[PDB]
From Swiss-Prot:
It is linked to Inclusion body myopathy with early-onset Paget disease with or without frontotemporal dementia 3: An autosomal dominant disease characterized by disabling muscle weakness clinically resembling to limb girdle muscular dystrophy, osteolytic bone lesions consistent with Paget disease, and premature frontotemporal dementia. Clinical features show incomplete penetrance. Amyotrophic lateral sclerosis 20: A neurodegenerative disorder affecting upper motor neurons in the brain and lower motor neurons in the brain stem and spinal cord, resulting in fatal paralysis. Sensory abnormalities are absent. The pathologic hallmarks of the disease include pallor of the corticospinal tract due to loss of motor neurons, presence of ubiquitin-positive inclusions within surviving motor neurons, and deposition of pathologic aggregates. The etiology of amyotrophic lateral sclerosis is likely to be multifactorial, involving both genetic and environmental factors. This is Heterogeneous nuclear ribonucleoprotein A1. It is found in: Nucleus; Cytoplasm. The lineage of its organism: Eukaryota, Metazoa, Chordata, Craniata, Vertebrata. The modification Phosphoserine is found at residue 15. It comes from Homo sapiens (Human). Residues 88-178 are annotated as: Globular B domain. Residues 1-87 are annotated as: Globular A domain. There is a cross-link at residues 1, 71, 172, 176 (Glycyl lysine isopeptide (Lys-Gly) (interchain with G-Cter in SUMO2)). The chain holds residues 8 to 190 of 372 of the full protein. Identified in the spliceosome C complex. Identified in a IGF2BP1-dependent mRNP granule complex containing untranslated mRNAs. Interacts with SEPT6. Interacts with C9orf72. Interacts with KHDRBS1. Interacts with UBQLN2. Interacts with PPIA/CYPA. Interacts (via the RGG-box) with the HOXB-AS3 peptide; the interaction inhibits binding of HNRNPA1 to the intronic sequences flanking exon 9 of the PKM gene, preventing inclusion of exon 9 and promoting inclusion of exon 10 which suppresses formation of the PKM M2 isoform and promotes production of the M1 isoform. (Microbial infection) Interacts with HCV NS5B and with the 5'-UTR and 3'-UTR of HCV RNA. Coiled coil: none annotated. Involved in the packaging of pre-mRNA into hnRNP particles, transport of poly(A) mRNA from the nucleus to the cytoplasm and modulation of splice site selection. Plays a role in the splicing of pyruvate kinase PKM by binding repressively to sequences flanking PKM exon 9, inhibiting exon 9 inclusion and resulting in exon 10 inclusion and production of the PKM M2 isoform. Binds to the IRES and thereby inhibits the translation of the apoptosis protease activating factor APAF1. May bind to specific miRNA hairpins. (Microbial infection) May play a role in HCV RNA replication. The gene is HNRNPA1.
Amino acid sequence: KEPEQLRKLFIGGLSFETTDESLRSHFEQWGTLTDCVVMRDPNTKRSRGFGFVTYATVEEVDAAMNARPHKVDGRVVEPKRAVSREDSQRPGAHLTVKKIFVGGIKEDTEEHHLRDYFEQYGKIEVIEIMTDRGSGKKRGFAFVTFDDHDSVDKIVIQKYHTVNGHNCEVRKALSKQEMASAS
DNA sequence: TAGGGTTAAGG
């Protein structure tokens, strides 16, 4: 019995006419749904254009994501790992990114260290261990790029990540400008 | 395309 948060998917871009029933009829093809709902405006009752689907196990969530692209009621929608209400308050928590910031890695951390932990989440395209300009000093963080945005989401929703023997913090990478406006 | 009357008491 895995946590409800990890068994749930945010479904974005829903057609205006998709309902709890039609959404369920589609996603039920990859497993048992324990919850399925279309979010709509309290007053107008109008669909807000998104919803959530929750499966009995994360294995079923994974099958659902492996089946992208998904078309619901004639509309290509965008399935995403559900980000908790708490983590949703963070800047850029809902961005569709392929790169993650990895902070707090030992100075002697090498690429194979990052691969042995991250490759399990998806195909890695780029690994950059950051150093100081002119100094050459290791700065204690790195960037890892995957070929699927879901590899990143699968990672950032977990709390701990062990690299080169110790825990490190992992977040979605923000651009220079996204970083500045977030400060 | 970010949540459903789902987030700080009273000792």
